[PDB]
């Protein structure tokens, strides 16, 4: 067992996240420099997020070792994800939701049901925690609880494109993001974000509480940006090449606005209904947590 | 949903339509032929022999 | 005193926008003979064969 560090696991440098930036090593951060915004005339305006059904998955016994980590990078940001509704991963999730469970989340981000020593595994008070939100990814796909796959798509562009004034103000224009971009860029942004531990990210999301928690959402603001861009890049309506003075400049628009395309294109990842479905499912829990 | 195809260039298409018109007295009819089967696939008008 | 030489459009301009070829043009015309119209035409048409 790992001890959760009073930071949070995110502070420890085995799940630092990083992303190529043209084939070479960089911090999210400093790419999200690279981004810039072309406004346009239409407005997003967030309403609030709906809360979270308190539902969870039952906690029902499953054969193997679920990959949950796995499960959730490859929904948000792996391309062509299948079967990402399938119920069982959840149960399993659920079961780790439980006061004294036997079951394990190790590091690898597999679930393991035997308490196995060989395999380090986060502190089971924490990822009670993780997964007593985080189940409900189970139920994304229920009638009774999809989440808005549009609206919640404002959220996203304010936590991206916003400056601190407008995620003050509540409202943006509706942006063209922009970056000077190499071949296949936010396809091998999306692989290289597919790579992360996001385990570490929402399980500190969740365990975290007051300070500790408010610096970890500081210090980790331009991850879970990361995440939401190549979400938004998932979902935005058209994103084309711009040649100027020899250098292809990425076009995305429009950030915060979910078009709902389901079709695959070259040049980002897709989601399909139940992707779409799952990924506004998450950013629900994942908003829910982070505003509050 | 994507047709592995090339997109249709309309600048390079209408500079090439203007230079046949400039240079290929054939095109006109061509053109004509097209609109024409249309018209005669509508079937809107015949000729009575009345 | 001089120095004649093939000086690229794009060396000039700095909007690649315009500019589709390059020196080697201008190279390989200088390989061909002064062509009269009709061996202009004779050349399309064979090629268009």
């Known amino acids: 067992m790992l001890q959760q560090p009073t930071g949070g696991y995110t502070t420890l440098e085995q799940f630092a996240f990083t992303i190529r930036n043209d084939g070479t090593n960089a911090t999210p951060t400093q790419f999200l420099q690279l981004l810039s915004y072309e406004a346009t005339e239409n407005e997003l305006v967030k309403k609030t997020i709906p809360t979270p059904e308190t539902h969870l998955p039952s906690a029902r016994n499953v054969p193997g070792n679920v990959y949950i980590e796995d499960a959730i990078t490859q929904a948000l940001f792996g391309i062509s994800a299948q079967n990402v509704n399938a119920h069982g991963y959840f149960s399993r999730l659920s079961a780790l939701a439980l006061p004294n469970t036997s079951a394990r989340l190790g590091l690898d981000g597999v679930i393991y049901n035997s308490e196995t020593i060989n395999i380090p595994f986060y502190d089971p008070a924490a990822v009670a925690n993780f997964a007593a939100t985080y189940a409900k990814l189970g139920n994304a796909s229920t009638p009774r609880y999809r989440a808005d796959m549009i609206d919640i798509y404002a959220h996203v562009g304010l936590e991206l494109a916003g400056t601190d004034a407008e995620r003050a103000a509540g409202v943006m224009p509706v942006k063209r993001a922009k970056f000077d971009s190499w071949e296949g860029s936010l396809i091998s942004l999306s692989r290289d974000v597919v790579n992360w531990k996001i385990l570490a990210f929402l399980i500190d999301l969740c365990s975290l509480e007051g300070e500790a928690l408010r610096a970890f959402k500081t210090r980790n603001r331009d991850v879970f940006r990361m995440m939401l861009f190549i979400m938004s890049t998932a979902v935005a309506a058209n994103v084309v090449n711009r040649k100027v003075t020899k250098r292809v400049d990425r076009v995305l628009e429009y950030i915060g606005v979910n078009s709902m395309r389901t079709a695959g294109r070259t040049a980002t990842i897709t989601y399909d209904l139940s992707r779409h479905e799952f990924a506004a499912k998450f950013l629900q829990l994942t908003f829910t947590r982070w505003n509050a | ?50 | 005193r001089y120095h004649e030489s093939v000086l690229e459009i794009a060396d000039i301009f700095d909007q690649a926008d315009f500019i589709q070829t390059s020196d080697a043009v201008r190279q390989l015309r200088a390989l061909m003979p002064t062509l009269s119209t009709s061996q202009i035409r004779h050349a399309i048409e064979r090629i268009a064969q």
């Not at chain 2, 592995?4 to 309309?10: I, N, T, Y």
């Not at chain 2, 007295?25 to 000729?47: C, F, K, W």
Request: with cysteine.
């Open chain 2, 1 to 50: 949903a994507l047709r592995p195809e090339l997109a249709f260039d309309h600048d390079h298409i209408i500079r090439c339509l203007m230079l046949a018109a400039a240079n290929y007295p054939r095109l006109e009819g061509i053109i004509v032929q097209i609109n024409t089967g249309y018209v005669a696939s509508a079937n809107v008008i015949r000729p009575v022999s009345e």
